[PDB]
Structure 1
Amino acid sequence: GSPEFTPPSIKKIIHVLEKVQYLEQEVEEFVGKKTDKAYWLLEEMLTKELLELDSVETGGQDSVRQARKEAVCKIQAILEKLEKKGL
Structure 2
Amino acid sequence: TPPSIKKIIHVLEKVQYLEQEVEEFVGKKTDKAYWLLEEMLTKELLELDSVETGGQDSVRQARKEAVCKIQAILEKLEKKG
Distance 1:10 1:58 in 2: 8
Q: CA deviation at 1:54?
A: 0.7
How many residue pairs get matched? 81
Larger Rg: 1
Q: CA deviation at 1:17?
A: 1.0
TM-score by length of 2: 0.74
Distance 1:14 1:57 in 2: 13
Counterpart of 1:33 (choices 19, 22, 28) is: 28
Asked whether the equivalents of residues 22 and 73 of structure 2 are also in contact (C-alpha less than 8 Å), the reply is: yes
Cα 1:55/1:12, change in 2 over 3 Å: closer
Structure 1: which 4+ aligned runs deviate by more than 6 Å? Answer: none
% identical aligned pairs: 100
Q: CA deviation at 1:84?
A: 2.9
Show structure 2 runs of 5+ residues with no match: none
Distance 2:34 2:44 in 1: 16
Quick check: 67-76 or 8-17, which moved more?
Answer: 8-17
Q: CA deviation at 1:59?
A: 1.8
Q: Secondary structure at the match of 1:58?
A: coil
Q: CA deviation at 1:7?
A: 6.0
